[PDB]
Design an enzyme around this catalytic site. Structure first.
Site, short mmCIF file in Angstrom:
data_model
loop_
_atom_site.label_atom_id
_atom_site.label_comp_id
_atom_site.label_asym_id
_atom_site.label_seq_id
_atom_site.Cartn_x
_atom_site.Cartn_y
_atom_site.Cartn_z
N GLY F 38 33.02 28.86 38.02
CA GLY F 38 33.84 29.14 39.18
C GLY F 38 35.32 29.07 38.91
N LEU F 39 35.74 29.14 37.65
CA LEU F 39 37.15 28.94 37.34
C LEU F 39 37.98 30.05 37.96
CD1 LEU F 39 37.01 27.53 33.72
CD2 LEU F 39 36.38 26.56 35.90
N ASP F 40 38.95 29.61 38.75
CA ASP F 40 39.71 30.44 39.66
C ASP F 40 40.65 31.31 38.84
OD1 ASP F 40 40.49 31.38 42.14
OD2 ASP F 40 41.72 29.62 42.61
N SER F 41 41.62 31.95 39.49
CA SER F 41 42.65 32.66 38.74
C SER F 41 43.48 31.70 37.89
CB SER F 41 43.55 33.44 39.68
OG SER F 41 44.22 32.53 40.53
N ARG L 50 49.26 29.71 47.78
CA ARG L 50 48.23 30.37 46.98
C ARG L 50 48.16 31.86 47.27
NH1 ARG L 50 46.22 27.16 42.63
NH2 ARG L 50 44.44 28.33 41.77
#
Ligand SMILES: CCCCCCCCCCCCCCCCCC(=O)OC[C@H](COP(=O)([O-])OCC(O)COP(=O)([O-])OC[C@@H](COC(=O)CCCCCCCCCCCCCCCCC)OC(=O)CCCCCCCCCCCCCCCCC)OC(=O)CCCCCCCCCCCCCCCCC
Ligand SMILES: CCCCCCCCCCCCCCCCCC(=O)OC[C@H](COP(=O)(O)OCCN)OC(=O)CCCCCCCCCCCCCCCCC
Lengths: 108, 48, 97, 48, 144, 85, 106, 49, 56, 48, 151, 134, 161, 446
Positions: F38-41, L50
């Site tokens: 699930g590693l985000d941007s 964000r």
């Protein structure tokens, strides 16, 4: 991103990368051992322009002012200063103001 | 015995102090050593 | 020991060059060294002194060292030779002009 | 470690005599020491 | 070919020549931009580079000749030197502007210099007497 | 000393097991960053940045985008250091 | 070629010394001859001959007199360095009318 | 420089040379001598190079 | 004539022949030279010291 | 490295003028010679 | 021999002087032939004043005399310099002891040397030097001491 | 092998911005205890905003970039054994054909190497013939 | 015929992968084969084999001789301390002999062939006088350079004529 | 000197006889050795043969000419490889050698000028018969016509001198002095083109760039020096007129020096760097010469000799690259330290000599010339400093960029260093160190 300006350059410009590899790895002309280098247009372009640009030189105000202040005024001013100072110094010398004691560089 | 002494004392004094400050903020080990060299050398040239 | 090679150009030609240099130079030096040691130690330096009033040295008398004695008398024309050379030649040219 | 000693005993046939005020001769030690205080204090920093 | 074979043509003056020249130098039609050809110009030679520096160019990009960070056929800038990393060039925008660098240096130098000469007028010292010298006719008096 | 391919693997594994915001159990070694990790941007480059500090070199800015898996990271470290052998 | 070929190369090939790329002996005799004529013949014997050359420019002789002449003038009591090419009495200056402002030089 | 490390080759002669220089320095100090050996090359216009 | 000097010094003689001819010719120049031979104003012996001594 | 650490100490203290090491023999003698000789404000303050 | 190392430096001085002086007495004296070498005495010459307008040989003879004389007087300046050089080296306190008493000889020598030869430059022959003296004599008689301008 | 395109997405212009920022923290803060504090304090500054509109993202770069440039350590933590290092690229090695020109006696030190060198050479020729069918 | 390699085939094997960046960006399984092979035969175990006459070829006869009087020592002294220590003894015997020999030569040349008033352009020497000490022979010593002739003697104050 | 002359004539046949490249070479060195032995001269003319003399000024110039003329054959062997009419090459060289000897020994001005301008032909053969670039044609046009366009006009000055003087032996002119204000420019400027001068440098870069190793070595090694040798002999009687109009020449030389050095920095061709560099040094020589002071002249003689030697060696270096990597460019040539490290030693040394690093007969020059100019006018120092500064500056760049950076990717296998070239580089430099021991023969000629 111009809509593919980077891409449009990409296609062709990545082709000759491989030909450079083919040339560099070429076992045959490297085997000939005669020296020399894979031809490179930028190098050939660069040498030719470097040796020849007079046919482009238009003697206009730009070039004239550029050259004038590049050497001419330097040459003239420096030469004039040299002659002026020497004229003064020699004038004192031929007047005999400074005797054979004070003067310097007696031995050149 | 001439104003060269005054001129040098200006410069040597200044550089040793400039080096004596720059050495604190510099982080490249060899560079800090070199700065200490100048800081010490400035003293030599000033006493001279 | 655990040697891992290194890409290095040839050193042979350069090494041979030094060897030829050292070889031939010593070749020339050895007779030269012999000759200089001989003259200086077998003969050595002529001593300076006054003129004997009745004497007249020949041009080779005026150099102290023997190898100079050999060179000047045998191999180089005298200064007095190359002096009269000009005096002759300048005499003709002045007259001609 | 021995440092200048060997020279100091063999270079100065006429050692310079310096009888100065106590607030000057000793001052060379404490104006010196405050630098080390700052050098080891300004470096030592708490997180926030 | 030889240099005379490769001599650059005169500055292109209509759009077709622009298309041809850009191909002559392998440049795209907009990539090609000849010099001003105003009286000291190379003419059709493209005007590339001239940026802050060559080392500003990509550090890790695949380069045919990493030496100058250069790929294969590509028009070398007329001023390749004077912008090469071995010559006037940097990798990143400067922090300040030219006046800043010179001003910060020289302004300090002038002030500190002048303030020194002012203080040389008042050269402090240790209040001690003049150095005594034995000599003919000199008769300094002992405190006795 | 030289570098051993198995130890490169365990070392990237060690940091990965160490990294909290990843799925703690460190699911299959080939865990894609956006799929199960699930590693985000931004979490992706935090991964790359630790790998940098651990392995003593910057990864290229775009070439991180080539690194899309811990298998890739080993594969990129291997290409650098002659680890195939 | 294989291991033993590299290990013990044959005496057929020969590494040119840059002078002749056809015959071994022609190359080697050229280099041998060329090296002798250039190095020993000039840069040993010739250097030796100069180094022991006799007085050609008469510098040493000039500094023969230099000691004597100075010593001769110092007990003689005459000027050590006379500033006149010949005796100021020997010269005969012409009269001011002859001068007539002939741009006399200092 | 074919059988022994060049570091050894220079090191030993360097230590040997400078100790000799050091001891000569003492001799100069205990006598306070100043030698000015000179070897001339050419000389023109009364100057001596 | 060791086959390392075959035909090479042999032709090389002719340059040495040039030096011999060159030497002899210039020696004859020393013959037309003679006008001041011992009759100069600096080295010139006045009269005597001849003794079969033609200095140069 | 307790040897290199210790040796780096010796360099520091010789350079830092900790007593009876290289700096103390040298830096000291200079600084009071500055005191003895009449000098300028900045040159004085700057050395210290 | 009060001092220890000086009482040792002597020992190496005996070491160094030993073999050389032995060599001098051993393989020189029994192997040396006696020969003599004298020193020129060039006759004087009729200088430019004497020679005629166009006597090229005579003029050439005069210049060579001028050159050799230049080379000597050129030198006498050097020797006086070397002489002063020794004095300044004599003793560390000893500079004013004999600088002016000895240097001034060198000072006079320079000025005299300048007057005769100086200010001509290369190619200078007897003619240009000789006539310069003539010009200076005329100037001295007319405008007075050089170093006063004119009247 | 593939040489990548130069096109860049705003995500990358923003994430590599975060990368450079992390670097700029290093060059200005060293102590790892201090660092992780401020690095995660940095994250909040990249987290509070964000998801914003593109236009605000452009202004966000207009501020973000300046912060890096105006707050860049005068001595950035340039990396040791990489491009721009303090000792990187210390030496170079020439193309193998230099080894090809060893004098035969020079060749006579590593016959096993040169023998295998000869074999690999011919096999490379076959490989290059393959590389595009010659 | 003639050559330089003896007939070796002038190519290069590595290919794209010479560059650290190039290998590090992308490189194919056939390229993994070659590169591993290249770095696999990079290793070497035995050592630089000895070519006997190569030393002779690169060692001229003149050099050969004066190696002998000190190399002849090695052949017999080698087993006593091994080759490494034996050569070390050879070398420093050679250099020590050279140094001590030159020393006497230089001292001789400054003792007998200084640059005097006859020869010029050699090493002319000049010195200052020693430091007297209370209790020394002729302690209150007078100046020896009596007259300017003393200065710049160069052997001329001791002329034969 | 007829000994030398007849030796060269009897060497001429070897050009016809096949396979005499190396036999000729050894002979030319051998006669150089003989000419070395013959050395006793003073300022006066000596060895007065029928019309050939020799002197301090001529003796060293001849030795350099014989020296360099033998070193040609070491430099050029591709002629033999190609069989490119080795016979014409050898004949051209010897013919040139004889002309140089006769030029430097002609005791008459007219005899001197005659051989001086006779040398126009054999040099032109040397470039044209063995050139490489297509520019070789226009280059030959530049060389020949820049020279003849001024070298011919001094022919009038020579004859005018005859009419007013009655002969042309050098001593005879010295006795007189001329101030007609055209004689001065006609002779001076005519020599200045071959010197050359910065404003007429134009031809010289072209001639060097598109000429073989041999021709370029000749061009920079003698031709420029030969112009200067004439000056030294001729200015004896141009003094007064020179004094009135001299500030112009010294100004342009000094000004041009810093400029041409900056041209060197920006230049991107090995021969172009050296060519411009050689113009720079000959700028300072022209300056000290026109000072006419003793220090200037005696130093000028030295700097001409040393400059010729260094310029030759640098050209051999340029030939080496041109013969391995087949391209004169700075860009292609790089990192050679990795391919010929023992050669890069010689690259450094020859570079060192050109920036006046001792023990170097070049350096010995600048001390003399700089003393002269500084005495002549204190104003010069403001440009003398920069002139030497930029002198060393481009030499640094030449040495570094050519030998230092990472290698070039596209470079096809080329043979390594070889005894011929190694011995060639030692031979040009080592005498350049030798001479300082006995500069007095190369330092005193006035
Ligand atoms: C003369 C001569 O060449 O004799 C041979 C030899 C030089 O060749 P070498 O000593 O064998 O070089 C080392 C190896 O050959 C290995 O040499 P290399 O192939 O590794 O190359 C090292 C160096 C070769 O040169 C050196 O390594 C330094 C030795 C002096 C040259 O040349 C280079 O490639 C570096 C660029 C040159 C930089 C200039 C260094 C000289 C500065 C001169 C300052 C004075 O000189 C000597 O016999 C004694 C040199 C010791 C210095 C005394 C001064 C002379
Ligand atoms: C004050 C004394 C300062 C001494 C330095 C003089 C300036 C020339 C020089 O060599 O300095 C280094 C300079 C820049 O080199 P660097 O910045 O380190 O790396 C290349 C960056 N593109 O190096 C260069 O760029 C070479 C420039 C050529 C020399 C020009 C010197 C001009 C002198 C003043 C005008």
């Amino acid at each position: 991103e111009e809509q593919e300006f980077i891409k449009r350059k990409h296609e062709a410009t990545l082709k000759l990368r491989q030909e450079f590899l083919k040339q560099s790895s070429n076992p045959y002309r490297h085997a000939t051992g005669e020296g020399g280098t894979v031809f490179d247009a930028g190098l050939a372009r660069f040498q030719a322009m470097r040796v020849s640009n007079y046919e482009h030189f238009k003697p206009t105000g730009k070039s004239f002012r550029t050259g004038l202040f590049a050497v001419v005024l330097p040459i003239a001013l420096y030469a004039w200063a040299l002659k002026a100072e020497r004229d003064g110094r020699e004038e004192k010398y031929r007047t005999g103001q400074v005797a054979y004691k004070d003067r310097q560089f007696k031995f050149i | 015995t001439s104003w060269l002494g005054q001129l040098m004392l200006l410069l040597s004094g200044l550089t040793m102090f400039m080096a004596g400050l720059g050495a604190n903020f510099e982080f490249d080990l060899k560079k800090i050593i070199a700065l200490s060299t100048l800081s010490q050398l400035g003293l030599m040239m000033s006493i001279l | 020991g655990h040697h891992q090679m290194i890409i290095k150009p040839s050193r042979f030609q350069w090494d041979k060059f030094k060897d030829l240099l050292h070889f031939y130079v010593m070749l020339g030096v050895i007779p030269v060294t012999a000759l200089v040691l001989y003259a200086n130690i077998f003969v050595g330096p002529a001593q300076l002194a006054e003129i004997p009033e009745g004497y007249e040295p020949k041009h080779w008398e005026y150099e102290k060292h023997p190898i100079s004695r050999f060179i000047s008398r045998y191999i180089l024309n005298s200064d007095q030779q190359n002096y009269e050379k000009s005096l002759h030649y300048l005499y003709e040219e002045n007259e001609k002009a | 470690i021995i440092g200048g000693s060997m020279l100091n005993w063999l270079i100065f046939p006429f050692p310079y005599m310096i009888c100065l005020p106590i607030y000057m001769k000793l001052l060379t030690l404490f104006v010196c020491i405050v630098g080390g205080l700052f050098g080891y204090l300004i470096s030592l920093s708490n997180l926030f | 070919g030889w240099n005379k074979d490769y001599k650059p043509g005169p500055y292109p003056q209509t759009e077709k020549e622009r298309l041809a020249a850009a191909k002559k130098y392998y440049l795209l039609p907009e990539e090609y931009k000849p010099y001003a050809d105003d009286g000291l110009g190379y003419g059709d030679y493209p005007k590339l580079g001239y940026g802050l520096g060559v080392e500003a160019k990509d550090s890790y990009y695949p380069w045919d000749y990493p030496e100058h960070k250069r790929n294969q056929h590509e028009p070398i800038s007329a001023d390749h030197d004077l912008y090469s990393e071995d010559r006037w060039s940097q990798a990143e925008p400067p922090r300040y502007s030219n006046a800043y660098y010179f001003a910060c240096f020289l302004g300090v130098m002038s002030g500190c210099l002048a303030l020194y000469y002012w203080l040389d007028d008042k050269k402090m010292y240790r209040p001690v007497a003049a150095k005594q010298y034995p000599s003919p006719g000199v008769k300094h008096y002992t405190f006795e | 000393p030289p570098l051993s391919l198995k130890l490169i693997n365990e070392r990237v594994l060690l940091v990965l097991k160490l990294y909290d915001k990843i799925d703690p159990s460190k699911l299959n070694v080939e865990s894609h960053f956006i799929n199960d990790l699930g590693l985000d941007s931004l979490d992706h480059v935090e991964v790359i940045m630790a790998m940098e500090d651990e392995f003593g070199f910057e990864i290229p800015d775009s070439d991180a985008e080539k690194l899309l898996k811990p298998a890739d990271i080993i594969k990129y470290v291997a290409d650098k250091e002659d680890v195939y052998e | 070629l294989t291991t033993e070929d590299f290990a013990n190369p044959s005496p057929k090939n020969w590494q040119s010394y840059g002078f002749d790329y056809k015959d071994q002996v022609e190359d080697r005799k050229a280099t041998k001859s060329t090296f002798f004529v250039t190095v020993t013949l000039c840069l040993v014997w010739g250097s030796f001959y100069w180094a022991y050359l006799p007085d050609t420019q008469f510098r040493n002789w000039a500094q023969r007199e230099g000691f004597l002449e100075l010593r001769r003038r110092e007990l003689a009591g005459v000027d050590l360095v006379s500033p006149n090419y010949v005796d100021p009495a020997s010269i005969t200056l012409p009269s001011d009318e002859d001068l007539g402002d002939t741009e006399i030089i200092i | 420089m074919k059988y022994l490390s060049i570091c050894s080759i220079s090191f030993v002669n360097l230590i040997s040379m400078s100790l000799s220089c050091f001891l000569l320095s003492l001799y100069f100090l205990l006598n306070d001598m100043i030698y000015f050996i000179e070897w001339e090359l050419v000389s023109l216009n009364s100057m001596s190079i | 004539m060791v086959l390392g000097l075959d035909k090479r010094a042999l032709w090389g003689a002719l340059p040495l022949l040039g030096f011999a001819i060159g030497h002899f010719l210039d020696k004859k120049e020393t013959e037309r030279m003679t006008m001041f031979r011992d009759k100069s104003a600096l080295y010139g012996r006045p009269a005597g010291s001849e003794g079969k001594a033609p200095s140069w | 490295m307790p040897l290199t650490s210790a040796c780096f100490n010796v360099s520091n203290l010789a350079l830092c003028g900790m007593p009876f090491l290289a700096g103390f023999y040298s830096k000291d003698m200079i600084l009071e010679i500055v005191s003895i000789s009449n000098v300028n404000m900045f040159s004085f303050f700057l050395y210290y | 021999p009060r001092s220890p190392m000086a009482s040792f430096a002597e020992s190496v001085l005996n070491v160094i002087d030993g073999p050389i002086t032995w060599f001098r007495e051993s393989i020189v004296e029994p192997n040396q032939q006696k020969q003599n070498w004298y020193h020129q005495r060039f006759r004087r010459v009729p200088t430019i004043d004497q020679c005629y307008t166009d006597d090229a040989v005579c003029r050439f003879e005069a210049d060579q005399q001028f050159r050799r004389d230049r080379m000597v007087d050129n030198e006498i300046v050097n020797i006086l310099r070397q002489r002063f050089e020794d004095c300044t080296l004599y003793e560390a306190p000893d500079h004013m002891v004999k600088c002016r008493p000895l240097m001034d000889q060198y000072e006079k020598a320079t000025e005299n040397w300048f007057i005769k030869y100086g200010d001509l430059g290369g190619y200078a022959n007897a003619k240009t030097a000789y006539m310069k003296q003539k010009h200076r004599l005329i100037w001295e008689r007319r405008h007075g001491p050089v170093g006063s301008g004119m009247k | 092998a593939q040489v990548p395109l130069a096109i860049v997405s705003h995500k990358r212009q923003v994430c590599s911005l975060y990368k450079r920022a992390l670097r700029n923290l290093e060059s200005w803060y060293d102590r790892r205890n201090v660092y992780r504090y401020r690095a995660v304090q940095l994250r909040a500054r990249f987290d509070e905003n964000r998801s914003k509109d593109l236009g605000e993202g452009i202004r966000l770069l207009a501020c973000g970039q300046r912060e890096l440039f105006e707050t860049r350590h005068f001595q950035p933590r340039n990396f040791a054994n990489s491009a721009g290092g303090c000792a990187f690229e210390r030496e170079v090695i020439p193309p193998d054909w230099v080894l090809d020109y060893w004098h035969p006696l020079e060749k006579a030190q590593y016959p096993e190497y040169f023998a295998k060198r000869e074999q690999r050479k011919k096999e490379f020729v076959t490989w290059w013939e393959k590389q595009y069918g010659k | 015929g003639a050559s330089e390699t003896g007939g070796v085939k002038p190519m290069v094997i590595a290919g794209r992968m010479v560059r650290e960046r190039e290998r590090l960006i992308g490189m194919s399984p056939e390229e993994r084969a070659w590169r591993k092979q290249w770095l696999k035969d990079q290793e070497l175990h035995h050592g630089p084999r000895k070519v006997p006459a190569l030393e002779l070829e690169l060692n001229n006869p003149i050099k050969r001789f004066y190696r002998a009087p000190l190399d002849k020592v090695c052949n017999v002294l080698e087993p006593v301390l091994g080759f490494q220590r034996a050569y070390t003894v050879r070398f420093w015997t050679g250099k020590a002999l050279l140094a001590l020999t030159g020393i006497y030569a230089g001292a001789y040349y400054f003792k007998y062939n200084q640059n005097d008033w006859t020869r010029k352009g050699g090493w002319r020497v000049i010195h200052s006088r020693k430091q007297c000490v209370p209790g020394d022979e002729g302690y209150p010593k007078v100046s020896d350079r009596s007259a300017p002739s003393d200065y710049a003697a160069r052997g001329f104050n001791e002329s034969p004529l | 000197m007829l000994k030398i002359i007849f030796f060269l004539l009897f060497l001429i046949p070897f050009c016809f006889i096949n396979n005499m490249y190396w036999m000729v070479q050894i002979m030319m060195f051998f006669i150089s050795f003989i000419f070395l032995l013959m050395n006793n001269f003073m300022n006066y003319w000596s060895e007065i043969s029928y019309f050939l003399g020799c002197d301090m000024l001529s003796y060293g110039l001849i030795l350099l000419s014989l020296w360099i003329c033998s070193l040609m054959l070491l430099a050029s062997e591709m002629i033999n490889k190609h069989n490119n009419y080795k016979n014409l090459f050898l004949l051209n060289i010897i013919i040139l050698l004889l002309l140089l000897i006769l030029t430097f020994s002609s005791m008459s001005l007219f005899m001197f000028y005659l051989f001086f301008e006779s040398s126009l032909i054999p040099t032109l053969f040397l470039i044209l018969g063995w050139g490489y670039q297509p520019e070789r044609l226009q280059a030959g046009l530049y060389l020949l016509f820049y020279t003849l366009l001024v070298s011919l006009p001094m022919l009038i000055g020579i004859f005018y001198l005859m009419n007013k003087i009655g002969s042309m032996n050098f001593y005879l002119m010295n006795n007189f002095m001329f101030n007609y204000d055209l004689l001065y420019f006609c002779l001076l400027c005519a020599f200045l083109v071959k010197m050359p001068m910065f404003l007429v440098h134009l031809w010289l870069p072209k001639a060097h760039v598109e000429a073989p190793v041999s021709g370029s070595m000749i061009l920079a090694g003698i031709m420029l020096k030969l112009g200067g040798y004439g000056m030294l002999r001729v200015i004896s009687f141009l003094q007064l007129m020179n004094l009135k109009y001299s500030f112009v020449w010294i100004s342009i030389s000094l000004v041009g020096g810093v400029l041409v050095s900056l041209v060197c920095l920006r230049q991107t061709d090995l021969k172009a760097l050296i060519a411009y560099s050689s113009v720079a040094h000959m700028g300072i020589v022209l300056s000290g010469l026109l000072t006419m002071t003793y220090w200037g002249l005696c130093g000028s003689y030295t700097l001409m000799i040393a400059h010729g030697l260094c310029s030759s060696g640098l050209f051999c270096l340029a030939n080496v690259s041109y013969e391995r990597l087949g391209s004169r460019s700075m860009l292609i040539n790089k990192g050679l330290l990795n391919f010929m490290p023992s050669m890069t030693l010689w690259w450094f040394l020859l570079s060192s000599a050109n920036m006046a690093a001792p023990p170097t007969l070049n350096l010995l020059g600048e001390i003399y010339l700089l003393n002269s100019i500084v005495s002549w006018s204190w104003i010069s120092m403001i440009l003398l400093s920069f002139l030497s500064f930029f002198s060393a500056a481009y030499t640094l760049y030449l040495y570094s960029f050519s030998q230092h950076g990472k290698l070039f990717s596209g470079v096809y296998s080329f043979s390594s260093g070889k005894i011929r070239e190694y011995l060639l580089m030692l031979l040009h430099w080592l005498p350049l160190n030798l001479l300082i021991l006995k500069s007095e023969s190369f330092m005193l000629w006035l």
